[PDB]
Amino acid sequence: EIRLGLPSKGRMSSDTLDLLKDCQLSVRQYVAQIPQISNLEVWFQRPKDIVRKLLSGDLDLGIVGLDVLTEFGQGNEDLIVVHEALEYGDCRLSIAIPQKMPQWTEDLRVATGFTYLGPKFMKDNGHVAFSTAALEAAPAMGIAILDLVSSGTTLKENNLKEIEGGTVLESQAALVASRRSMIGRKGVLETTHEMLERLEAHLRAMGQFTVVANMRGSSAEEVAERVLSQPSLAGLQGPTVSPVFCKRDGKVSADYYAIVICVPKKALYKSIQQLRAIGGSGVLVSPLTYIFDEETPRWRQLLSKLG
Amino acid sequence: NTVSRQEIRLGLPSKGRMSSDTLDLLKDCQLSVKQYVAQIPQISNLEVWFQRPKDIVRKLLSGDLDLGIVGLDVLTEFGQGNEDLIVVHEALEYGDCRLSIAIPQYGIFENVNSLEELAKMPQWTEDKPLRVATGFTYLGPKFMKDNGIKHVAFSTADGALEAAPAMGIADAILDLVSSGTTLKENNLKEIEGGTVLESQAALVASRRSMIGRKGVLETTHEMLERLEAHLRAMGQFTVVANMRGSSAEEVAERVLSQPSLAGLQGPTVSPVFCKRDGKVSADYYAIVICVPKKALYKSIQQLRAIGGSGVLVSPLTYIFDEETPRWRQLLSKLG
Amino acid sequence: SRQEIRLGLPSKGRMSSDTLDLLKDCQLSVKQVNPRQYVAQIPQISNLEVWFQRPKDIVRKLLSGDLDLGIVGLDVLTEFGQGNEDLIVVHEALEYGDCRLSIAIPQYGIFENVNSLEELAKMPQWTEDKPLRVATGFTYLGPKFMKDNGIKHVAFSTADGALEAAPAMGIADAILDLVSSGTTLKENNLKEIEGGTVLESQAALVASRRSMIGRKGVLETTHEMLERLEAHLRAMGQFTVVANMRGSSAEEVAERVLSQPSLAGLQGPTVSPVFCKRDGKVSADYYAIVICVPKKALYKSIQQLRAIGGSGVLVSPLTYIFDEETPRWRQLLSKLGL
Amino acid sequence: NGNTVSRQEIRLGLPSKGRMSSDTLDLLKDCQLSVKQVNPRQYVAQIPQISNLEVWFQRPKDIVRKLLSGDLDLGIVGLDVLTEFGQGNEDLIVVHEALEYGDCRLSIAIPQYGIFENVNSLEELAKMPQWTEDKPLRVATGFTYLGPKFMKDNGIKHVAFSTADGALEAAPAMGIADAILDLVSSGTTLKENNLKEIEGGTVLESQAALVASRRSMIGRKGVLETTHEMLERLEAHLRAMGQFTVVANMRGSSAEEVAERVLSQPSLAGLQGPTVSPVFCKRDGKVSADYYAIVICVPKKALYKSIQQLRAIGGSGVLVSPLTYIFDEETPRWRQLLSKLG
Amino acid sequence: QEIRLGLPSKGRMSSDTLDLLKDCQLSVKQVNPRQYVAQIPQISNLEVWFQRPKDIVRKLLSLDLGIVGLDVLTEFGQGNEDLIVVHEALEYGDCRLSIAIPFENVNSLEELQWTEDKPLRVATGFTYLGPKFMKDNGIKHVAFSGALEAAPAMGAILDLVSSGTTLKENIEGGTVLESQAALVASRRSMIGRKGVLETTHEMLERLEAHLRAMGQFTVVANMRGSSAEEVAERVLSQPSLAGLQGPTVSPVFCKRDGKVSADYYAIVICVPKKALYKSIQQLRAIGGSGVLVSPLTYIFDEETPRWRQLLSKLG
Amino acid sequence: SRQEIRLGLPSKGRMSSDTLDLLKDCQLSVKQVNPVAQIPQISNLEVWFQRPKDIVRKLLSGDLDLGIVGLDVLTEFGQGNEDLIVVHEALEYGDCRLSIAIPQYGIFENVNSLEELAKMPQWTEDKPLRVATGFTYLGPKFMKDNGIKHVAFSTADGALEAAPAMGIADAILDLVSSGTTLKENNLKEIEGGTVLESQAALVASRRSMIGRKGVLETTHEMLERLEAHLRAMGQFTVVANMRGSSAEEVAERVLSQPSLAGLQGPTVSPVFCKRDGKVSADYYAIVICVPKKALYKSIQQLRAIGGSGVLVSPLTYIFDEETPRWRQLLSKLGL
Ligand SMILES: N[C@@H](Cc1c[nH]c[nH+]1)C(=O)O
Ligand SMILES: N[C@@H](Cc1c[nH]c[nH+]1)C(=O)O
Ligand SMILES: N[C@@H](Cc1c[nH]c[nH+]1)C(=O)O
Ligand SMILES: N[C@@H](Cc1c[nH]c[nH+]1)C(=O)O
Ligand SMILES: N[C@@H](Cc1c[nH]c[nH+]1)C(=O)O
Ligand SMILES: N[C@@H](Cc1c[nH]c[nH+]1)C(=O)O
């Protein structure tokens, strides 16, 4: 049996279920199954509960923000980040001040819910005491900020600004695994492998469009010659070119050719312009679930961390 | 109005089904949105403001917005026919309704089946006018000053607008009709010529913003083409079929004999190989065509008649083709 | 009277959301004009109008003729239809709403060494005085099941609150309830018995025979409905997989793909040329292949595709896969014959 | 039957959902009979102020079913529900027939306009040539039982019934039915849909009622005494609901002079007369009974007028406060219950 | 034939208003909760309409009575002589509309650069009343145009202040006005519609008596004593045990050695709620026990000048 | 650092609503600004809403001065800390008991007391008695006192009561109120299995009451208001009209009756009514307190002695001679 922890509430939870639904890995009850991965069982927990059960051995995998992983995991050696950047849950844990200064003789208050990571940053380049408090309004009320910043709007609303070097950590959602489970529970390691591969291929896919265009041409080679002259019509390896038939004088002839290329989403609009310039029409654009390519070093780095 | 601002602002409905359908349209365009102000990353430097629809029209006129998506009813009532508002796309194919006049089927309106015979009723004079309950304070007076009805007072009715004729608050109603079931439940009928306006959700733009603010026209162009290609796609199916044949050309002749297997320009035909007696040969060919969704079932039958099997059907985000006159007409309105 | 085809759908419950999700996955989205109102449209099918009802009301209205089609669990069809021959199951297994209506008895006590329905019947505790008490919501199917299996002294009741708690509270001796995973039964120290299953149930497409033979348009939209649901189930199902591969000709690449066990596709790989510029000349150095891959096979197929030099492997889902018609249509027409 | 089950508790069924539920819980709170909802998800709570009294929250239809089977002993339910689901069973005894909430009438409504414009009477509706065995009068209603009974009684033969989809009142406008049989309270739903009531169209007048099972009352230990207490408490609560206690300071020489003053006033009579007591205050360091306080019950509808009268005779500092119960002589209801029991 | 009184539909004003009527034993008979008309049956022909406060002012300007914030009355009422506030202080919804600035050493509005160009930008919801304060206070350089408290960070403010904590999260003379909930009536009904004047009279009397009561406690104590006058002297020796006019003193009997005698006396006084606790201490000091404390719906006393002031406004 | 008294109250659950209902009925109304609050009825008193566990902890840390919490939370999380003093141990809501439940079937059939669970031998150092519980601290302390050491405790996932049926645990340690959960899950209490009796309680910190000026007197005020209200909740005031010749005759009648005793005896005053144009005190009104549980029987008794028009009404407070809860608190404080 293989157990994977997922966030139970917050946007991290809805974004995680949205991620799984986009991978075609769909999951009142709190325990579910992902049937497309053999013997994989999902447990919905708060992220701190994912870290706690991963350390104890009740879970084998988890998806958690890097902030929760580093504070509640404490840099414990048992935890290994398999994928460090699932590209959601973007934030940074940092300190905010109003818009070395010697006023402290042990007799500087920072309000934070991160009871642990504040103290650690004081050994690196730091007289600091921590509290727990509307957290964002704490400097104005006199409680004491060290908090998560994403868009930074909360900082501007409370007349608070950010410092150079004030970012203690950059955080995304991450796929993490238990070391005791990967070495000791047979069957876990291969599904963490499959999970990493699927997440990489989905992230690449997310990503691209497949673009298919009708083009008038005499040969497949002339048409490909036209597509490859265009800078952003390169595709992964080049246009797939196939014949397109239509009835002329009661007889059929391949007057058109259909090309298919991958196009990055950010490049789509200008690509369309380019395709119109070389005579393409009826341009079908569609999304992808996965794009599998050559494996990234992430698997080998995981094995290097394991031995 | 005149504010140094790097970003193009697009107003979207904040509450109602227009909000949910608008966010649904953007998600179907793969235009994911990032409080009350968000960003659309895919369109360069495009920033979305969620507002009440009247506030979208008001802020477009005041200059706080550059584009908006709003129903044509909200646009015509609150814009009041101002020439600065240009509909860029007049038919986003959701929010369909019509603002019209409904009158009772009973009482004195039994044989009042046209707006004209509603007019010539000696019941209403300067003292006791024709009471019409509506939330459309501007458009009612306009519709009947355009059609010559002398003595009409308009009111906003307490609670259930449709029940006002039954309660005695008003003699008729001026309201939005979609399926018409609300009218039928209260013994109300429309009339010939009673339709004040036909409405859909529309992409609207400010003339002053497009002319004066850098980048507005290009992102309006991108949004219009994206909306047109997405509507075209929603639209069609991609249909891919395996067919046994000796050559690609024979297979193509077979699919083209069929009326609704034409596709956009014709079938794409490619070889399909399989192992026979340890040797492979292109015993099959796979064809690809676009099929309109309303033709899908019939197309499947036709594909079976010519030997097709394993017919894959899948949807499209966009279909980009030749640009519609909507762009050229917008530039015509701008000079 | 009327010229629209009416399709009944469950209004509340998990059956309702799963049904609307099935229709959206078919690109048959429902045009909820009023979300307070109970009637919507499916524009992709001509004159097809959806009515949101309680499932019992779907069966009642199919029998009365106010609906023509319905999607309902087989348990509800059996309990509220009572085997009326006018209700015909068109598609018997839409693969959601899986459960079984069965008998559960305590694990402990009097029922320790009772594990068959016959051994439940044999117990002597049950006479006209003091019968076997069964708590159930299935007012019709319980008595029929128990009169058919020779269990002679049984009284049935509806229970307050948690049906599964009725035997512990003393309200009842056994229950007749729906079992899916069976965890509710385990949580309440209950067990099924051999022969205790009254019926196996899924969501199903049902039609009125009077509507199909007598009302214009019903039989063809039932045909399209059956064909679309079957094709969608097949699609759910597969992935289309497209890979770039280096090769000199289409035949060499095809032989490489077919040498691999699970890269067979439905009929074999489609192989087309992929052109790329080398030294200012364009040439088909690569070829793109497309195959269907079953989803449970996806990962291994990827490995197989990498072994033969594949790259840039696009994976995407399908709304439909239409193939040869299943006998379900011919079976329907035979049921209509007379 | 649940008439044989051994249980120490006396069981009172209360409506689980609806306006009847909240109004019933309001009635209990106004009687200081607060229900200790042990679990809100659970359906059973306790009323600790009455010995061995346990409340079950049920559908009203389930309250009637359970009273007939003997699984409940008392219930509070509208008389419409009692007539529909009890069907006039002789075992159901109405102990209190008018709890003065849930007021409505089940009646027949037909369109104001159409063929029914001159139809104001019920047998005007009967002497109508439109309905035969071929095409009957369609009536939408949720009352599967009471409709047939009412119209077999009033000389109308050719009638069909439907449990209409959704908005019952909109059934005649949609063409689902030609009339409706429904509950009317203020009648605004009838006016909103251009429908009207009829002479003789009223099927029954209904309020919330305290009902009991006769087999339970005679056979189950403790039931009769707690229905006695409930009826008494309810009667008193209604009387209190009702009155104000009014207390006034008055300048006077003796209690009898003050009493003479209050009793000259028409609405200062009280239940039996003003209670009069001395009110002392320090003048120049000595206390003396310069004032007197009077206590009277005043009906709420008289309060304002009573105040004016109390000022005319020199009253001030008029304290007005409400009452939980007013117990007086028993009404005939209890004896009537015993006559129905034998 | 009908007298109509408007009440707020949503907000704390709504729950506080229905709580006010609920405390007055004028229960509101909401026959349809979805509908907007209810009745007060204890006052003959008194009908309640639930709507937003601007709508209440709108209909009083077009209703016979309304209960609305003084802010809504002054902004939407236009200072019209037809709207007469009969009771100006129902003691709920209390607040002040005032100006807050981030602007450090500026503490008076006069110190509040601002010209034709760059006119003092205040984001504010007071479409009518905003102009009034500065058109009257001599800053001619002001323009008016969400999540208001962050407006100084986002790009001074004129808003409602109650406890002021919302202001603290983000001046002298900045107060535009002080507001409470008020019972207002239209002159058109009072001079012209029969029965409006009389039910406004009853409403004003009930509201004044309830406000007095809200207010006090009735306190009843057992005290051992020989005579009523002795016990009364003991109660009156204590400063805040005076009551309205003095303690009501009555005999309390108990069985001693098989014979009954008035060994105790019960006193009744009104005690203000704010004074209750020390009143209990004082009552214990003079030998009281079993002190029953209970609330009041109304305390009617002599009419306030408000009715005669209203009639002076009516002539 | 801070200057005004802080009172912790439960934030969520029925404990929260029942607590706010009690305080509002005690005239300690909480003025919630928006979701920290204030109680203005006690001069200068400030409320903090927290999770029950947090209140105890914050009392221990110094951040709180008072709290209202169930005694189970107090004993489980306070760990018997001497800084926490219960001021009122029984606010008469949140009633429950923390106790041990075991199955009725199987091994445990003929086991109906704690000592018989002890003299059961299924449990060894290797395979101990598995008890599912949320009380990480309290449970072990209870069983070393009169049970075995062959006990392991666990936190059950999900439904604690279903843990013995699922095989997770052999017994549970849980809160019992009405006992329906245990009966629904075929579980049973044992004699001597009760670990603790719990109600909601008013708790205070010793450091705050002795050391922070103003804390002790506002706990005095809230303790007296809470005790007073509880006493009143409690009683009825009952007032009856009685025909009689003298007040003493009427008093003798009420006192001849067992349960009409009142607190000290009936108050008796004259009731006047018009006879022949003359007024005379033909009646007398008596006032007594009646415990609510006795009300109905007292009514019968009042009728037996000729009473009529019996007014019954409730009380907010009943203050008497000072309760020993204050004197005992001061004894625990060293005055
Ligand atoms: N041959 C095209 C499309 C494709 C990608 N993968 C398979 N086909 C490209 O390389 O971009
Ligand atoms: N060649 C097919 C499919 C296609 C459209 N666009 C690109 N390919 C058609 O013309 O319909
Ligand atoms: N011929 C490929 C792809 C395909 C399916 N259908 C049409 N083409 C296969 O059989 O998998
Ligand atoms: N004696 C007063 C007050 C009272 C009624 N009952 C007891 N006391 C009256 O008859 O109104
Ligand atoms: N006599 C007491 C109580 C009271 C007021 N009104 C009537 N009684 C007082 O003057 O305060
Ligand atoms: N004297 C009555 C009522 C009372 C109590 N306290 C004051 N009065 C009694 O002792 O019960």
Find the residue in E nearest to F256 (Cα): E255
Residue identified by tokens 């009954």 is E260
Residues of C in CB contact (< 8 Å) with A are 239, 244, 272-277, 282, 284-286, 288, 295-296, 298-299, 302, 305-306, 311-317
Distance of CA D151 to the CA centre of its chain: 27
How far apart CA E175 and CA E163 sit, in angstroms, is 14
How far apart CA A181 and CA B139 sit, in angstroms, is 70
Short-list E243, E233, E241, E288, CA closest to E266: E288
Name the E strands within chain F.
Answer: 6-10, 31-32, 37-38, 46-50, 66-70, 84-88, 96-103, 129-133, 151-154, 171-176, 187-198, 200-205, 235-243, 267-274, 279-291, 307-314, 317-319
Tokens at A127, concatenated: 């007289």
Check CB contact under 8 Å for A158 and E168. no
Tell me which long-range contacts F140-149 makes (C-beta under 8 A, separation of at least 24).
F142/F195, F146/F114, F146/F115, F146/F118, F146/F192, F147/F114, F147/F117, F147/F118, F148/F118, F148/F123
Note the helical H segments in E24-64. Answer: 53-61
Say which residues have a Cβ less than 8 Å from residue F157's Cβ, sequence separation at least 6. F168
Cβ–Cβ < 8 Å for C275, A237 = no
Cβ–Cβ < 8 Å for B93, B202 = no
Ligand nearest to the CA of A215: 2
Cβ–Cβ < 8 Å for C194, C149 = no
Is the C-beta atom of C258 inside 6 A of ligand 3?
A: no
For residue F66, the 8-state DSSP code is E
How far apart CA C108 and CA A288 sit, in angstroms, is 54
Helix (H) or strand (E) holding E224: strand E216-224
Cβ–Cβ < 8 Å for B140, B149 = no
How far apart CA A164 and CA A158 sit, in angstroms, is 19
Is the C-beta atom of C84 inside 6 A of ligand 3?
A: no
Label residue A214 exposed, middle or buried (CB < 10 Å: 0-12, 13-18, 19+). buried
What distances in angstroms separate CA D308 from CA A67, D279, F110, one per listed residue? 73, 22, 76
**Candidates A39, A200, A236, partner chain C, best to mutate (most C CBs within 10 A):** A236
Q: Buried (b) or exposed (e) across A179-212, using 16+ Cβ within 10 A?
A: eebbeeeeebbebbbbbbbbbbbbbbbbebbbbb
Q: How many CB atoms lie within 10 A of CB C96?
A: 14
Distance of CA D90 to the CA centre of its chain: 22
3-class DSSP state for residue A268?
Answer: helix
Say which residues have a Cβ less than 8 Å from residue F286's Cβ, sequence separation at least 6. F239, F240, F242, F250, F251, F254, F266, F267, F268, F307
Q: Which residues share a beta bridge with F188?
A: F102
Q: Which residues share a beta bridge with A211?
A: A261, A285
Say which residues have a Cβ less than 8 Å from residue C147's Cβ, sequence separation at least 6. none
Q: In what order do the strands lie in the sheet with C154-157?
A: C154-157, C132-136, C174-179, C99-106, C190-201
Residues of B in CB contact (< 8 Å) with C are 178-179, 181, 237, 240, 242, 270-275, 280-284, 286, 293-294, 296-297, 300, 303-304, 309-315
Q: How many residues does chain F have?
A: 335
Mapping DSSP onto H, E and C, the string for F202-254 reads EEEEHHHHHHCCCHHHHHHHHHHHHHHHHHHCCEEEEEEEEECCCHHHHHHHH
**Residues at CB less than 6 angstroms from ligand 4:** D 270-273, 275, 295-297; F 239-241, 271, 285, 309, 311
**DSSP states of C173-235 as a string?**
SEEEEEESSSHHHHHTTEEEEEEEEEEEE-EEEEEEHHHHHHSTTHHHHHHHHHHHHHHHHHG
Q: Which residues share a beta bridge with B117?
A: none
Tokens at D73, concatenated: 């002993």
Short-list D163, D181, B187, CA closest to C66: D163
Say which residues have a Cβ less than 8 Å from residue B253's Cβ, sequence separation at least 6. A245, A252
Name the E strands within E21-147.
Answer: 37-40, 46-51, 65-69, 83-87, 95-100, 120-122, 142-144
How far apart CA E253 and CA E261 sit, in angstroms, is 5
The closest residue, in CA terms, to atom 2 on ligand 4 is D296
How far apart CA B222 and CA A270 sit, in angstroms, is 10
What distances in angstroms separate CA E5 from CA C1, E9, E182, E199, F262, one per listed residue? 52, 12, 12, 10, 46
In single-letter form, the type of residue at position B333 comes to K
Residue identified by tokens 């300690």 is F28
Helix (H) or strand (E) holding C64: helix C55-64
Query: In degrees rounded to 5, what are phi and psi of residue F37?
Result: -135, -175
Tokens at B329, concatenated: 């007409």
Cβ–Cβ < 8 Å for F322, F250 = no
Name the E strands within B186-249.
Answer: 188-189, 195-199, 201-206, 236-244
Cβ–Cβ < 8 Å for B269, B248 = yes
How far apart CA F331 and CA F335 sit, in angstroms, is 6
Name the E strands within chain A.
Answer: 3-7, 31-33, 41-45, 61-65, 79-83, 91-98, 109-111, 129-131, 146-149, 160-171, 173-178, 208-216, 240-247, 252-264, 280-286, 290-292
**Residues at CB less than 6 angstroms from ligand 1:** A 235-240, 260-262; C 242-244, 274, 288, 312, 314
Resolution in A: 2.9
How far apart CA C215 and CA C67 sit, in angstroms, is 11
In single-letter form, the type of residue at position C207 comes to A
How far apart CA A280 and CA F138 sit, in angstroms, is 77
How far apart CA D108 and CA D168 sit, in angstroms, is 12
Helix (H) or strand (E) holding D248: strand D243-251
**DSSP states of C300-316 as a string?**
HHHHHHHHTTEEEEEEE
Beta strands D208-213 and D74-78 are antiparallel
- Ligand 1 centroid – CA A259 distance (Å): 9
Residue identified by tokens 């029950």 is F52
Residue identified by tokens 């790097």 is B6
Q: How many CB atoms lie within 10 A of CB C15?
A: 19
Query: In degrees rounded to 5, what are phi and psi of residue C327?
Result: -65, -5
Distance of CA A170 to the CA centre of its chain: 13
In single-letter form, the type of residue at position B146 comes to D
Q: Which residues share a beta bridge with E96?
A: E161, E178
User: Distance between the two ends of chain A, CA-based, in angstroms?
Assistant: 24
Tokens at C24, concatenated: 């959206």
How far apart CA F23 and CA D62 sit, in angstroms, is 37
The Cα angle at residue A57 between residues A55 and A61, in degrees rounded to 5: 80
How far apart CA E74 and CA A232 sit, in angstroms, is 65
In single-letter form, the type of residue at position B179 comes to S
Helix (H) or strand (E) holding C100: strand C99-106
Cβ–Cβ < 8 Å for F272, D263 = yes
Residue identified by tokens 């994977």 is A4
Cβ–Cβ < 8 Å for A34, A27 = yes
Cβ–Cβ < 8 Å for A26, A40 = no
Q: In what order do the strands lie in the sheet with A146-149?
A: A146-149, A91-98, A160-171
Q: Is B189 left (phi over 0), alpha (psi -120 to 50) or beta?
A: beta
Short-list B120, B113, B122, B131, CA closest to B167: B131
Find the residue in E nearest to F263 (Cα): E290
Q: How many CB atoms lie within 10 A of CB A158?
A: 23
Tokens at F136, concatenated: 């990480």
What distances in angstroms separate CA E24 from CA B71, E70, E248, one per listed residue? 48, 22, 25
In single-letter form, the type of residue at position C210 comes to R
Q: In what order do the strands lie in the sheet with C39-41?
A: C39-41, C48-53, C5-10, C69-73, C203-208, C87-91
Half-sphere exposure at residue C291, Cβ-oriented, CA atoms within 13 angstroms? 30
Tokens at B291, concatenated: 């099929």
Beta strands B130-133 and B152-155 are parallel
How far apart CA E85 and CA D55 sit, in angstroms, is 49
Q: How was this structure obtained? A: X-ray
Query: Can you state the angle between helices D79-86 and D146-153, rounded to 10 degrees?
Result: 90
Residue identified by tokens 């007057």 is A255
Say which residues have a Cβ less than 8 Å from residue F97's Cβ, sequence separation at least 6. F175, F176, F194, F195, F196, F197, F198
Distance of CA C338 to the CA centre of its chain: 28
Query: Can you state the angle between helices B216-233 and A268-277, rounded to 10 degrees?
Result: 80
- Ligand 3 centroid – CA A23 distance (Å): 22
How far apart CA B61 and CA B85 sit, in angstroms, is 8
How far apart CA F143 and CA F156 sit, in angstroms, is 19
How far apart CA E51 and CA E40 sit, in angstroms, is 16
Short-list D298, F265, F290, F279, CA closest to E250: F265
Domain ranges of chain F: 1-94+200-233, 95-199, 234-335
3-class DSSP state for residue E77?
Answer: helix
Query: In degrees rounded to 5, what are phi and psi of residue C251?
Result: -70, -40
User: Distance between the two ends of chain D, CA-based, in angstroms?
Assistant: 23
- The alpha-carbon radius of gyration of chain C (Å, integer) is 27
**DSSP states of F20-43 as a string?**
HHHHHHTT---EE----EE-TTSS
**DSSP states of C117-134 as a string?**
HHHHHH-TT-SSSSPEEE
Q: Buried (b) or exposed (e) across F217-250, using 16+ Cβ within 10 A?
A: ebbbebbbbbbbbbbbbbbbbbbbbbebeebbeb
Cβ–Cβ < 8 Å for B150, B111 = no
- Distance (Å) from the alpha carbon of B182 to chain D's nearest alpha carbon: 10
Pocket test for ligand 4, best of D275, D294, D310, D323 (most atoms within 8 A of CB): D275
What distances in angstroms separate CA C264 from CA B274, C236, C251, F2, one per listed residue? 8, 18, 15, 76
Peptide bond into F234 cis (omega under 30): yes
Label residue E172 exposed, middle or buried (CB < 10 Å: 0-12, 13-18, 19+). exposed
